[PDB]
Amino acid sequence: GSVTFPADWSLKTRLLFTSSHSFSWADHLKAQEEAQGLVMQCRATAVNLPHSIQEPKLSTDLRCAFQQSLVHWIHPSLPWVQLFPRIGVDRKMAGKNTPWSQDESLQQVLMSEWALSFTSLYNLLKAKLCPYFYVC
Amino acid sequence: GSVTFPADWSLKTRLLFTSSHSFSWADHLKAQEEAQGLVMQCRATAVNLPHSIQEPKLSTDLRCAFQQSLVHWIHPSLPWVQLFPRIGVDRKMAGKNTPWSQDESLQQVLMSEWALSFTSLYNLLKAKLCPYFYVC
Amino acid sequence: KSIVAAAGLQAGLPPTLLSPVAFRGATMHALKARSVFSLEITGPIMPHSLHSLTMLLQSAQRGSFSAGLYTHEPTAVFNTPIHDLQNCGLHPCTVEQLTQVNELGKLSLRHLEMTDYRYTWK
Amino acid sequence: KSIVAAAGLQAGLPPTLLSPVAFRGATMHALKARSVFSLEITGPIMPHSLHSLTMLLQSAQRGSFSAGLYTHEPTAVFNTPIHDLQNCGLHPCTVEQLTQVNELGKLSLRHLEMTDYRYTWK
Structure with missing residues (x-):
């Protein structure tokens, strides 16, 4: 049994963890825990949990770290359009309100904003302030 | 002459600074300066500049602090719609592509996302992790 | 049921949040x-942004500038008087300034x- | 001129950025x-998220869980071999894991x- 699994650089789309013990600790998160998780993620705080926990439901650090681990950043913010899987999806992209398909000035505005975001992301990557990023 | 001006809680819309000396230091910001400013803002870093600067154009801290000071967060991200002045602004809101005006499921989706953002913002405010916020 | 307009130019648009x-x-x-x-x-200017800008310009301009x-x-009307913030994410000087009593x-x-490191607001 | 599709369902929509x-x-x-x-x-799972989740579940489940x-x-195909990151904003364990040589x-x-704090990947 190896200590760590090999690094995988592929993009998963669904995870299913099964265990004999209870996963109920990761449910009914309080408002304080969610706020602390978001703030910790934005401020890059490292959390070192003990070797073993016997009362997960009473551990605030574990739940805050969970909320921190469930945070990522995506540039295009269109809540009514699916955006992560872009290759080989058309059933989930069918029958949606897309004004950018016909209007052209709107498309140019979106393109300019995307170019600025891409340039900023690359500049962050160059200064070693960002490990990696995906363009889909 | 008082040391500090009284606190103003109104929302300005344009600022014009005039001075005898040159403002050219706040121009042609390099990529590194912008990236550092964004990272500093996201990580809440306090910058204490010296009492006086004689070569502003060669001060990286000043320009990084400028880029940090020019950052704020807005929930609705619709690049083709004006969003800050919402009271008494109809000339700039005329003739725009608004699909949410007629479609109803899209409006419900936008409302749900807005409700979640509002709840998260209030929860952050309660835990003293956010000083204030405006709802327009 | 009255936050979102049901008729006009801003029909269906949810309210804007600033933070x-x-x-x-x-x-x-x-x-x-x-x-x-x-x-x-230009843009939505919040008090902390204005205070930080003044703090920067004080050192950059050697305590001599004017602002409109x-x-x-x-x-x-938000200036109407009403009467541990270290982690709020603000500069301590800004926290000190904002924890005052509304005069206006x-x-x-x-x-x-600002002339010779003295403020004379109009 | 070929990043943005000009005909189809995803016509005019710019590429997605993840970070x-x-x-x-x-x-x-x-x-x-x-x-x-x-x-x-569910959602777009990046390697740091998976590593952090495994780190949390190791302590929470007392080193006994299975993942699909x-x-x-x-x-x-991104696993194809190719051969000061403290401020990148990642846990040091994640940085140590990601600075390896691609085996797959x-x-x-x-x-x-994971059984008895030992990893047996399939």
């Missing part, structure tokens, strides 16, 4: 700065002048 | 977690099992 720190669903934005000597900054502030009128009433600053 | 840290124009998002014992997490990973096929080729993990 100095990140929250769920936030979108990082930036203010436009342009120098002509004069410097112009354009205000959004329907938010001028229904009135907002229209001109700020 | 573990904030950037200009970013929008904070969250993954959906739901427990049924079993725990389900569903992969996006067109991104499986055109292949991605499909089943991960």
Whole structure:
């Protein structure tokens, strides 16, 4: 049994963890825990949990770290359009309100904003302030 | 002459600074300066500049602090719609592509996302992790 | 049921949220700065941004500059008097300034002048 | 001129950007977690998220759990071998893990099992 699994650089789309013990600790998160998780993620705080926990439901650090681990950043913010899987999806992209398909000035505005975001992301990557990023 | 001006809680819309000396230091910001400013803002870093600067154009801290000071967060991200002045602004809101005006499921989706953002913002405010916020 | 307009130009648009720190669903934005000597900054200006800008310009301009502030009128009455913030994510000087007693009433600053490291607001 | 499709369902929509840290124009998002014992997490899963989740579950489950990973096929070839990151904003354990040599080729993990604090990937 190896200590760590090999690094995988592929993009998963669904995870299913099964265990004999209870996963109920990761449910009914309080408002304080969610706020602390978001703030910790934005401020890059490292959390070192003990070797073993016997009362997960009473551990605030574990739940805050969970909320921190469930945070990522995506540039295009269109809540009514699916955006992560872009290759080989058309059933989930069918029958949606897309004004950018016909209007052209709107498309140019979106393109300019995307170019600025891409340039900023690359500049962050160059200064070693960002490990990696995906363009889909 | 008082040391500090009284606190103003109104929302300005344009600022014009005039001075005898040159403002050219706040121009042609390099990529590194912008990236550092964004990272500093996201990580809440306090910058204490010296009492006086004689070569502003060669001060990286000043320009990084400028880029940090020019950052704020807005929930609705619709690049083709004006969003800050919402009271008494109809000339700039005329003739725009608004699909949410007629479609109803899209409006419900936008409302749900807005409700979640509002709840998260209030929860952050309660835990003293956010000083204030405006709802327009 | 009256937050969202049901008829007009802003029909269906949810209210705008502004904040100095990140929250769920936030979108990082930036203010436009342009120098002509004069410097112009446009966009939604919140008090911490103005205080930080004054703090920077005090050192950069060697304590000598003048500022002309354009205000959004329907938010001028927020100055009406009403009477551990280290982790709020603000500079300690800004926290000290904002923890004061509101002196203005229904009135907002229209001109700020700084000469020889002294403030004479108009 | 071929990044943006000019005909089809995704006509005019610019490419999606994913990142573990904030950037200009970013929008904070969250993954959906739901427990049924079993725990389900859906959304775009990046390697640091998976590593942090494994680190948390190791302590929470006392080093005994099994994981089933569903992969996006067109991104499986990224494992092809190619041969001061303290401020990148990642846990030091994650930085140590990601600074390794790619062993897999055109292949991605499909089943991960941890028994008695030992990893036996399938």
